[PDB]
């Protein structure tokens, strides 16, 4: 086995399923969770692995690149097809449930809205520390061929919801945007309550597109906080549907889709806590 085959084999076969009782009442130790996390290969793509002339100008970080097999390719309207974003599988490996991407840069804002248009995205989840360019308007802006207007904006302690319309030619679409702050990169939130409220907000969001599309989830680099959010959502789904969760397997599936998803042992430990809270909050 080549290093890469070893990596892919691990990511396809690792697992640590836990009954919800084990998760809530007898979880693995912090040391056990750290050792388990550190075993998971990054599956990072090297700049050499990527043969897309001109891509570097559209990456926030030279070391964080989209895996080619799952990268989102931009169509021709809006010369290249590149955006630093990957399709991410959801519950039970369901295809294209999410797109994980970096926060747009001024020169990739039109690319970002083209992705939203092309993929029929109706929901954007943005993870940040309010302490990256605003790619949405205060009232109305034009970005390439797209006009974006704010229809509604509501504030709660946990997040801000903006209701946006995107217009391309005579066609207008709705996009819900949720901005969740107080999550510093390479770290976790101080408590898990707000995060679960965010998951509920996402779960409660109606479909508004002509065909179901991916939920776009982003943060500065689009791997750490982005990976934690998606893993939390899939974990909640497992707990609700099956009364068990395989958090190791979730992280491994995420890393097959985009390298480096969930950055730190502390974030992996926080995922366990958040899912134990979700389990405790389940009806009945």
């Amino acid at each position: 086995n080549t290093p890469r085959e070893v990596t892919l084999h691990f990511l396809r076969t690792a697992g640590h399923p836990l009954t919800r009782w084990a998760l809530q009442r007898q979880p693995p130790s912090p040391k056990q969770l750290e050792e388990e996390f550190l075993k998971i290969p990054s599956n990072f793509v090297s700049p050499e692995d990527l043969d897309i002339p001109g891509h570097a100008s559209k990456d926030r970080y030279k070391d964080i690149l989209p895996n080619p097999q799952s990268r989102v390719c931009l169509g021709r309207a809006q010369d290249g097809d590149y955006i630093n974003a990957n399709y991410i599988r959801g519950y039970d490996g369901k295809e294209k449930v999410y797109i994980a991407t970096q926060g747009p840069m001024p020169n990739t804002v039109s690319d970002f809205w083209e992705m939203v248009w092309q993929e029929e995205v109706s929901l954007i989840v943005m993870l940040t520390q309010l302490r990256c360019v605003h790619y949405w308007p205060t009232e109305e802006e034009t970005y390439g061929p797209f006009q974006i207007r704010i229809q509604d904006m509501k504030e709660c302690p946990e997040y801000t919801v903006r209701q946006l319309t995107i217009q391309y030619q005579e066609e207008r679409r709705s996009v819900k945007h949720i901005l969740f702050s107080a999550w510093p990169d390479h770290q976790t939130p101080e408590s898990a309550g707000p995060l679960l409220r965010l998951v509920a907000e996402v779960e409660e969001s109606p479909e508004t597109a002509a065909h179901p599309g991916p939920i776009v989830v982003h943060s500065s680099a689009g791997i750490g906080r982005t990976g934690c959010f998606i893993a939390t959502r899939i974990g909640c789904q497992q707990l609700k549907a099956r009364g068990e969760v395989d958090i190791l397997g979730i992280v491994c599936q995420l890393r097959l889709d985009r390298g480096g998803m969930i950055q730190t042992a502390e974030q992996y430990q926080f995922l366990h806590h958040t899912l134990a809270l979700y389990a405790g909050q389940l009806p009945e």
């Binding site: 926030r60 970080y61 070391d63 964080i64 990169d185 500065s220 791997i223 950055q263």
Partner: peptide
């Protein structure tokens, strides 16, 4: 830029 570097993130890790």
């Amino acid at each position: 830029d570097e993130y890790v």
